[model samples]
Target: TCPFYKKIPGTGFTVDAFQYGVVEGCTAYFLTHFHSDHYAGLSKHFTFPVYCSEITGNLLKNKLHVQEQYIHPLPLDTECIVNGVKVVLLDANHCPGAVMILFYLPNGTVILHTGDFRADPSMERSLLADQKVHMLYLDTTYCSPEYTFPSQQEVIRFAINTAFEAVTLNPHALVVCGTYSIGKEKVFLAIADVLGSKVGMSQEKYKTLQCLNIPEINSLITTDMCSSLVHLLPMMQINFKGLQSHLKKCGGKYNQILAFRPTGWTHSNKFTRIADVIPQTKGNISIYGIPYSEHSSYLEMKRFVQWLKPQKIIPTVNVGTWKSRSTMEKYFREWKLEAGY
Candidate 1:
């Protein structure tokens, strides 16, 4: 069964009008990024001309490889008129092709929808110079200050430091790390940079990266180069189950195992069982949890809203829908004399 629309308790209008076949009147549907949650329902349901950034279009075509009948590409910071609505794509800075959109209506209503974004200074400057934003829709994945994250550069540095430290401690030890195919390429790049050589990339990742024309770092080494480094191996494996089997095969030669994971696969019982299955070792097995996330934290959301000073705000991705909606409402209520909702 398709999980698309939610019926409103009384008004009869579904929470998502597009899901209930009520999108005929929409001027255009803007996609912030190509993430599954934001675009899952599009292919099966909505057929309105979809709009996104140029890089996003390439990513949608090359990565997810979705074939839609109509996809209008808008360049970053450029305005395009779509079905009588003026839409502008802004840099999101969270991922390679992510974007935030600003929509201007004929009735003089301005709406800004910030798809999964981060608090990079470059992104903030782009938004500040683009236009005078009126209504803002935010990404509040991490709505509380306690869920803070370090800068992307800082996180990469830490991951490199950890990996380098592991290599120094055990020259003949095997190091394993886990990361996503798209955004986590930076982490691998960092590892290569630290090691001062090219690291092996999976065929899919290598092809995708090559198509994008991203330059290779001097430190990167392909997994084929593993024969030279007695302590290192590129498993070409992703999930916990696959990694466990690979670890067992390397038992005799390696003295220690250092694994880098953004999420805690080792913390759960299911994953722990796989860890236990690996050949026992007196040398330590350390799992590093670096602060590498593609979404903006709560503090960044608060800062973006304050900087834009939008007349009204909307919550798009439903990360912290209740709290973010309430916060925006409170801000709008205080400045009631400024503009009408």
Candidate 2:
């Protein structure tokens, strides 16, 4: 019930708010990525002009079948004028088509809508470092104290190294990695590369991956299940019951199964390294919930916030919940005070 669709002050723009229904005052619609939560209300019948990265634009057209006339595919790191508002798109470092939208209002105010992002060090060192952001619409997905996980690089390396070790110990084991349709491909793809294994998945997902235009993925996909021990499945399907069913379906072609379920849910303040978390194993199947987050961690959020030192900060997640949102506000207050605001 938070105002996800609230128009930016002094503008007719609504970002990532298709679920709340169309607003009356809004004229320009901007989609940050192709994630279902952000693009929930988008449909073929829609008429408003939508702006997004070229990759996301192609996703909307091919996957959702949205008409090309209404889609405006903006390039990364380039500024363009949309409805008298100088706007730019920067890589969000979340998913393939994700981007952080920056708006320079006619009134000299600079607003940034970080549509769903992981604040990487490269972002802090690039064009974003020079801009003076007045208002920040941040991705507060992991705003609480419990979400200070390790950097994505460390986690990805841990996942790949761990998988490599496990496979070396059990050569006949099948590697099953969990992933969303779009995000978290880095984990499994890196694991496949290290293990020299081909990835198996449904043709539907294969077509979607093609939209990403990743050249390395071309030679790694295989149709025959027998040819590839590394397979990709939906994130939720990495559970014990699902893996058991899959093991039976394979009919003894593989001796054991090693699955990696990458998510931020497994993180906690007590664990210093992702390797500290143990795997859940029963018989020939094991599931490891790797601490992989697409959104900024609490520490990353703080770092980004302090770096920008924006005049105002808005929470994009856990907004309707008073307790959760209020907890997030405390950090914002402390940050503002430190910024000498």
Candidate 3:
């Protein structure tokens, strides 16, 4: 009766479980991503080898200090066989080391687990057109139709333009952008390159980016706040205490702040989630939370499912709550007509 980790019928493979949880029925294990919630209770000292992307394996081994040898790197775009299960890992595009796990069981069933990704355009030419996926573990983060937003590229372009304007408007004000510690480095990199500026972050977060090995964004890392024109902070670090102290120390006599938060929840109360990319100024600070994420928007989810044409979908998040299930169930109700699932 396992709810989260599925024991594929007629197969010895399983996806996701606590380190020592009773996945006794399975012979092989897979880790979709290194996010703590996705990690479940799996830890550094694990009893068995788990398959994941090279980046996720590095993150688990280097950052979170998980044991290296136990993390079997799932080489991207390559097929590997284990316990009679043929597995292929594809780029999830969510983070540096994230991947989608596609499993082909010996009994002719194909199961897919999307690791919090926006569906790549090339999928149809490669996997979707050729493979017949039977069961899918979907990332239903924005499964409901209310979520509609511009693409990540458009969001980055919007951010770059707005930030430069903000800097010119208040030349003395400090500009800060908050993002997820790992995945949103591309947005910060674009901001820095476009504005010809540097991005700063805490030593740990910068170190995390170093593992990503993108040479173009190396020099922006610093322990000093004054080193960069714009500071790149973690999403949680953009709150009251986080920004107030930074603003107080700004070299400008008229210390003002502008904060850009990249998120799909672009606060419009109509429940339609349609909003312009304008910054709303509150006090000395201006905040703009834009719609930007690796996860599929509701519309994107419909298109992805429609293309894949899977028979049944098992959502891959927050399964313990009744409300969460209700929300995920909305995906079937909303998209089944077109998706044919």
Candidate 4:
């Protein structure tokens, strides 16, 4: 489900609410990342100043063709005054140019909007380490206890190991990685780095990465599919039929297909450890569901609440229904009690 609400309470600023079509009395607009879910309604006809990191601003201009004049690329870790409210941007660790916004309002209140972040330990070194947060708009994508996935690094390592073994077993295997237009670049990039091979991507996706200006990833990307054994495609295209069609289109250059689809949904209570997770193989096609999540896990969210100790918590995702909202609140209450809030 998408973000249920658009406007941040107690402020005239609208964050990731472009889908609602110009909120009334909004003085400014904010974007946490370039994900379509967060920036659904933003278009060339849009008015008002939009604040985000420079990388995200570049993507908006290059991909969506948004006007540059109204795009404000705020520098990270620096405080800036916008309409009398002090604002700061911090890296969210979710995707390139993703940020966690900190708003110090004129009413002596401090608010933090963690826009789809994978909570990292480096967060403790910022103002959040000492200051008291009045209200927190959190990314509750994995709010339930059932979503206890492994760390990003751990999953990345598991993927690399699995691919290494698969490729070793079959010399002519074509490796495919499933990813979105913006996120999940790290997983494939690491795989390419370890494999020492150039990654094949579509022309459109390659141009999007050029906008991001990531030097390491840019150096390893190639639009020529014939030159690289490891190819990147949309997550939906990694299934059995899709792989079979792609292999046929390749004109018998590869004998087998080994694809990795990375997502948090692969996590389950049944798999006690990341190593125990297995791939689904059918004849010459095998698909591994990698538990590489961009969002924080259940334990990560709990540790974040314990550290920040925000007076109030607002769930920004998966709150479309009353039952789900109440379920999230129960966990929030339990976390708050443990933190002595």
Clashing pairs in 3: none
Tell me which of candidates 2 and 3 scores higher on TM-score. Answer: 2
Range of the 10 consecutive residues with the lowest summed lDDT in candidate 3: 266-275
lDDT of 4: 0.85
* Best candidate according to TM-score: 4
Q: Which 10-residue window of candidate 4 scores lowest in summed lDDT? A: 1-10
- The top-ranked prediction according to lDDT is 4
Q: Model 3: residues >4 Å from true position, as ranges?
A: 1-6, 19-22, 250-254, 267-275, 318-336, 339-341
Q: Name the runs in model 1 displaced over 4 angstroms.
A: 1-22, 42-48, 207-213, 217-242, 249-255, 264-284, 317-341
Q: Tell me the tens digit of each residue's lDDT in model 4 across 1-341.
A: 22435566667787887877657788899999999988888888887899999999999898888999989999999989887788899999888999999988888889899999998788989867767889899999988888877778788888888778877888789899988768888788878777778899899988998888687665799999998888999889989999898999889889999898887665353466887877788889999887778899888888988888888888898877899999998998898787787
Per-residue alpha-carbon lDDT of candidate 3 for residues 64-94, written as tens digits (9 for 90 to 100) = 6778777788677788886656888988778
Question: Candidate 3: what lDDT?
Answer: 0.72
Say what the RMSD of model 3 is: 2.9
Candidates arranged by TM-score, highest first: 4, 2, 3, 1
Q: Model 2 scores what on Cα lDDT? A: 0.84
Alpha-carbon TM-score of each model against the true structure: 0.72, 0.94, 0.87, 0.95
Poorly placed runs, candidate 4 (over 4 Å):
1-5, 267-270
